[PDB]
Amino acid sequence: ERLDLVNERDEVVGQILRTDPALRWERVRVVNAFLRNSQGQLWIPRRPNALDVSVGGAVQSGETYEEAFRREAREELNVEIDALSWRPLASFSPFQTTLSSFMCVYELRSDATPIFNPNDISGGEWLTPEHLLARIAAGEAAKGDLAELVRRCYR
Q1: Is 67 flagged in the annotation as binding?
Q2: I want to staple 101 with a disulfide (CB 3.0 to 4.6 A). Which of 30, 51, 54, 137 is the partner?
Q3: Which residue ranges does the record assign to the Nudix hydrolase domain?
């Protein structure tokens, strides 16, 4: 429930409670990841009726980006990142883009559909970035940074 506070250089300068009313997302770190198969499709869950990244969540105080990634992947998708191929896709700053927080975006490789945790995900589907962006453009519900992450990370 506690998060690290970071400056413009993504350097830790303090801590804050996740539920603190003074919380500012541009002052904290999150992780986001996309699961992509050999068909070039991304597994997009519905989180729960809005489209979202395959795996995503805030980095806990004292935690590194990779550790947060491993944690969210297992709690949301029941996936062990160490059991699959993955890599840092990109890193972004909230002041250099229109993304909400400082973040590291990863890409997980797998052709298997995840045995996701139903508590936060109602279902998911393999979608091409083109079709996904089209739905967002149409007005279908989606996390605020999903479209930008897809565009910045994939062409």
Answers
A1: no
A2: 30
A3: 26-149
